[PDB]
Symmetry: C3
Subunit: 492 residues, 3 copies
């Protein structure tokens, strides 16, 4: 009669990496890293994003004639923008604090356009002016959200405008100043030289003077237009005053919804699909804690890491046993007939052979491994990860600072995850061997000298053991005093 | 005769966490997180703070009439300010590089006010101007540290003033420029239009022109005042020149003491107490690696982690149940002398004991373990706090992301370290008990008989001296050889 | 006849650290931190650096008469500069966006010079101005790369100038505006009051007005000069216009080579040596992952930490024996392996060693060391950044970021080394005990354990017997009858 102790082996080919060995075959493994995406841009939470196409943020807000599809925009989840948009500032010029405006637009999910200074109120000036830089059907045109004030007759009276924010929320207002190319243009358009543009609110005070000089021609013009913005608070007034070179606003943008969003730089188009996490390459439909698709992401998303594989070993080592002899134990290798658990027995008494499994040790090890996996997974913080920021070309030091901070944090977390996986894999691999040896030691200690240790994990008895005795050994209820006299006689 | 190997147990309730099992009761434990405070604002190292009250830093430095108790201020440790103070710039306006000034004030612990430009030297101008936005008992007043210069008669001559820094340290000087509401105010205050204000030092050059326009009324006035500042070095000179719209300084703030300080944003009042670490909610009296009270602390304080529990297992696992059994059946609730030990049952009488060697080495190892976890933590002075304007949102976001990421890194590090360390400690105790059992078996050989419950049943009658020998490591197998062999057969 | 299981011991005095114990003597150890350096400033990859000496970047780029040796600088790898250079802006003034220029200079490597506005083109102005601040051999002089335009006779016509960037790469252009001290100076130099200087490119639009005021005297002058720069793109044009107070450029700086470079603040001189990693204190010749010389480095350089010691245990504990086995201590006679045996039969005694266990342990330790070393990424880092007096918050932010990352890495390295040392020292004991258990399991009941790690045989075990026991092919049935007879 025999009784042996061993573990479970199968035909799995999965491999894991530990700290002292690489490419170790395991029975079961878990992948906590996702590397796949659908390669499409979709709807977030059911709300489609805003597709700017070839337009830019400045072109959308100012009202470029090539951006007439965005004159009435519904609620959005994120903004899609190209790297180098073609239709932006049709009239050559600049845009002060552009990056700050783009950053503000990363927490706004809806705008409401309100007419604050109607065009017909300028009854002492000329409001129908344009340029061939922004041309519709050949004839010159202008921005659809701004008014160009020129002289009426042969005089330019002082232009005064005001607006009291009785809308209900913060309002965004944009104005501009025109810089001519020669004194001829200035005297043809505004009738006087030495003009000023003054804009004032409760917490704002600005006075700009036009610059007239010969400049290189961009879009066929040697002139420029400088744009500035402000955020008017509730129950607050904005005052405009100018002697010349004022590009007045007709519309003001009211922040109607607020939340978390961002600007995604991509060259693709939207497709009919839904998702909960959006990368510039495609959506992610996952429950795993990590991914390595793209750093920048919008929505609740797994952490990024510069890794190619991260596998957690949740099973035993796969060492298979290699003439109608006696089945060995855990010393030689695993068993392929034990399919009901991880650790078990094998009896060879008179009433047939057969395998079995020990439920207590298997349950304990399963609970421990599940707890380890859940501790690794669930001690990671997940939130909104809008990590897109823009910097001008006078802000190289700030851009380098942001790049270094992001790279350092990403490298730190990569190191953390990789080393954690390595140590945990080694610890679980040693755990399984410790458990098997502990079960063997318990069996030997409870069986005492009634048996004969064979040296390969098996126990040759000294008495005749029935299935009742075998289950007693498995149950840990073996009655040593009962068989003492019988076993002692056959020993010598 | 019987000898057994076991471990000590008690009636504890403290629970630790292990990466494999949660809620494991332990005999001893060490909490390395502090979660309490006194809820009061106290004195840092015996020096009281500067309680601004309803005043702002601009109001304190400019001389707001409602902050007359701050004209002379002693040495301080930190500044207490409200989130939205009331008495700031009584005259509506702005302040250039306000956040830079507030950051500079974070390393200054005392100021000395020096009269650098008296009011009586302006003998060619009028220096009694005032406004009703800054009013005392109904009549108009003005800032106490500044002079408003106005025409004397019907003339405003060119105003010139210079100062040489012979005080002995760096000096802070604040001036201002007035922006009227209409040309009428400009002409009845300064007699001419097209004025300038020029300030020049060895490393500074600034020229400003007033802006006259209609603005929404704040505090009743459509005018504004714009203030600037500079840091004058030792043995350096500052020049002032203006044809109008100049608010000249009367006093300068010399930096008398330097060090580490900060601005704490609270709404409370100072009380009578001492401390070493201060938080906006209260003071901390602790000597532990970690705390979870408030992020923005002033002083040498433990790192902040978003953890509600961080307990290091120092003692053994608590299995209460134990003739008498050994370590397989569980722990002993009667061995109150040490950690590992024995239990003998010879004919003289039963009794417990303790193994001094194993207990001492385990104690030293656990002590070194705890001290390595604790004394690897840099704790220097850091007054975490910075202010940004409404046009510096990107910088504010960068700073917030930096602090949040560092905090998350440190919480993950601490939690993982505690979990793995506790697992290793419990495994260490189990291994030590097993090693003691194995050593006893190895030295005791076949003269005894294992029972499977951790105990050994001898074959020779063993007295007290023999038992102290087997606990000593000086057991003599050959002497009990023939006697032991006889009865075993 | 005996066979024993033991481990190696020697006369080393190395010491490692562990999470449970400190000052542990080991047979073999590896130091993974380098604390030594050459002490000299060398050539990076065979290319010598740029030695500014007593000059500043502004002085080099403007043409300070004292810096007359840097008019034709060759290719370089990094720039050496002093903390407080002496020869800089000889004429007192400022330099707008100076730190941005210094940041841009950390990625260029040659800076070819191109004459864009030759001085002879100004036929309607006087171009021979100078000052005693920048005085050579007593007589007044001026910057060698700049032109000071004054009036000719009693007129100052409008000054215009253009340059189309057809060089083949980006260019750097610097101009200036002069601020006088009084109206007498302004009328003596430019003949008109109320002047302006206008500069315009396809993406720049700046207009400046002179400031006339009395200022403290620096270098004997109460007047100042303000300098600004721009980066002209390819096939772009820059326009200059002024009615006075213009310091026009004569040269432009075309970027010829781009790559990784930097600025080092040192007070030393270049010495004849070659290196690949350079610190402000010296050079590093290394094969080790770590170093604790100086935070700021240029080149292929190791990682930096606040660590005074980082030693990885690659061997056994040194517990020499005062023939016993592994219970007492190591053997000072086993010179061919980590774990081994010692036997004594009627041929003779002698030590030996195991091959499989020693090889497995060697491979495991080597893999551990290589994993610790090779998971640390390295790359070129431009740590050095400079900030102005009104950017204290940004400077503090940068300092806090660098310090925090560096303490994080220091803590990680320390904990990794401590836990790995504990793991190795437990691994060795586990391996020796596993060998002992394997031998006992194979040898069964035909022998007699003696407690110290040795086995006393019950039969007469010869040399072929002993190699069989070492091999793992011990025949239990062959000696079963003989062993059982004498045991009874
Ligand atoms: C309205 C118009 O066509 N003006 C042109 C100007 O005309 C003079 C007219 O005002 C006067 O009464 O009579 C004389 C003849 O006796 C002229 O006809 O003449 C200029 C040259 O002589 C033209 O200059 C050219 O303008 C180009 C630009 O056209 C646009 C543009 O595409 O930007 C469009 C409009 O003409 C105009 N917008 C208005 C008036 O509201 C803008 C305007 O010039 C902006 O200030 C841009 O600079 O220009 C090119 O700029 C070209 O380089 C220039 O020679 C006038 O178009
Ligand atoms: C000094 C004074 O009372 N000025 C008031 C001004 O009167 C003139 C006086 O200077 C002249 O000699 O004679 C005429 C009569 O022939 C006046 O009496 O009249 C203004 C109305 O027309 C008042 O304006 C109002 O001022 C308000 C603010 O008043 C104060 C203030 O408390 O801020 C009063 C101060 O005395 C005055 N002067 C100084 C030197 O600080 C300041 C000054 O105007 C500031 O510079 C304000 O920018 O103003 C309100 O602003 C109100 O809206 C306005 O109508 C003059 O008070
Ligand atoms: C060219 C010259 O010698 N100018 C000095 C000036 O003289 C006049 C001359 O131009 C006119 O035709 O005739 C009168 C007599 O009828 C004068 O001879 O007189 C000034 C004092 O009265 C001197 O002033 C001093 O200049 C110092 C600086 O000298 C330099 C310098 O080294 O920086 C000399 C340069 O030649 C001069 N000119 C140019 C074109 O660079 C510069 C120039 O003044 C700078 O722009 C200064 O902002 O200055 C000191 O500045 C000292 O404080 C001052 O009194 C003139 O040197
Ligand atoms: C482990 O596998 C990887 C890829 O499967 C291979 O590159 C590497 O050489 C393997 N390791 C060894 C020790 O062969
Ligand atoms: C703006 O409107 C609100 C509400 O109608 C009013 O209280 C406030 O006085 C108005 N502003 C001004 C400057 O009158
Ligand atoms: C996305 O994942 C969910 C699991 O929550 C699954 O039910 C659904 O079918 C998946 N959709 C696609 C398109 O893969
Ligand atoms: C551990 O105990 C806490 C209460 O002390 C309980 O909230 C938690 O669910 C328990 N966890 C487990 C795994 O039993
Ligand atoms: C300021 O005072 C110091 C010492 O009294 C003196 O050396 C210096 O020349 C003075 N400054 C000026 C501009 O005279
Ligand atoms: C135990 O060992 C110590 C060795 O220092 C010895 O002095 C003592 O007598 C021993 N005890 C007994 C009972 O032999
Ligand atoms: C240690 O032993 C080696 C033998 O290889 C010898 O060369 C060396 O000098 C010895 N060192 C000391 C300090 O005894
Ligand atoms: C123990 O280690 C410390 C370094 O932490 C060292 O200064 C000291 O000399 C060492 N002592 C011994 C006895 O090795
Ligand atoms: C500058 O030169 C380029 C040559 O490629 C030419 O295309 C361009 O028109 C020139 N610029 C101007 C303003 O003519
Ligand atoms: C640098 O170290 C290497 C060893 O890795 C050595 O071969 C070489 O000669 C050394 N060079 C110098 C200049 O020290
Ligand atoms: C030991 O094993 C080797 C296997 O490489 C074999 O060649 C040799 O004959 C064996 N020796 C004995 C004595 O079994």
């Amino acid at each position: 009669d025999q009784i042996c102790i061993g573990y479970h082996a199968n035909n799995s080919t999965e491999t894991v990496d530990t700290i002292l060995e690489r490419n170790v075959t395991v029975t079961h493994a878990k992948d906590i890293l996702e590397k796949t995406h659908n390669g499409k841009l979709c709807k977030l939470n059911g709300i489609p994003p805003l597709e700017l196409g070839d337009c830019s943020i400045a072109g959308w807000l100012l009202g470029n004639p090539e951006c007439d599809r965005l004159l009435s925009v519904p609620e959005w989840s994120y903004i899609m923008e190209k790297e180098n948009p073609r239709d932006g500032l049709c009239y050559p010029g600049s845009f002060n604090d552009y990056e700050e405006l783009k950053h503000l637009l990363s927490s706004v999910k809806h705008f409401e356009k309100v007419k604050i200074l109607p065009k017909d109120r300028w009854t002492q000036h000329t409001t129908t002016g344009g340029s061939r830089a922004c041309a519709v059907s050949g004839e010159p045109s202008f921005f659809r959200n701004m008014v160009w004030l020129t002289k009426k007759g042969s005089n330019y009276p002082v232009a005064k405008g005001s607006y009291n924010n009785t809308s209900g929320e913060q309002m965004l207002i944009i104005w501009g100043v025109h810089h001519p190319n020669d004194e001829t243009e200035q005297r043809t358009l505004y009738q006087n030289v030495g003009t000023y543009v003054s804009v004032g609110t409760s917490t704002l005070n600005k006075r700009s003077t036009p610059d007239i000089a010969t400049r290189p021609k961009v879009n066929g013009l040697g002139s420029r237009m400088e744009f500035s913005w402000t955020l008017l608070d509730m129950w607050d007034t904005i005052n405009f005053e100018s002697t010349g070179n004022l590009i007045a606003p007709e519309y003001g943008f009211k922040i109607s919804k607020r939340g978390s969003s961002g600007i995604m730089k991509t060259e693709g188009t939207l497709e009919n699909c839904e998702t909960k996490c959006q990368t510039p390459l495609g959506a992610i439909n996952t429950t795993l804690p990590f991914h390595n698709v793209h750093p920048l992401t919008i929505g609740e998303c797994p952490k990024y890491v510069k890794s190619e594989k991260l596998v957690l070993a949740t099973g035993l080592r796969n060492v298979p046993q290699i003439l109608f002899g006696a089945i060995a134990g855990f010393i030689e290798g695993g068993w392929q007939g034990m399919v009901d658990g991880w650790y078990g027995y094998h009896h060879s008494n008179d009433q047939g052979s057969g395998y079995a499994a020990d439920k207590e040790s298997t349950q304990k090890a399963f609970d421990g491994i599940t707890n380890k996996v859940n501790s690794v997974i669930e001690k990671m913080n997940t939130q909104f990860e809008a990590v897109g920021k823009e910097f001008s070309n006078l802000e190289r030091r700030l851009e380098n600072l942001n790049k270094k901070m992001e790279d350092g944090f990403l490298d730190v977390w990569t190191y953390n995850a990789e080393l954690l996986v390595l140590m945990e894999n080694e610890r679980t691999l040693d755990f399984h061997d410790s458990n098997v040896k502990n079960l063997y030691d318990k069996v030997r200690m409870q069986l005492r000298d009634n048996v004969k240790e064979l040296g390969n994990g098996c126990f040759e008895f000294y008495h005749k053991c029935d299935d009742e005795c075998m289950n007693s050994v498995k149950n840990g209820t073996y009655d040593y005093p009962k068989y003492e006299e019988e076993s002692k006689l056959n020993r010598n």
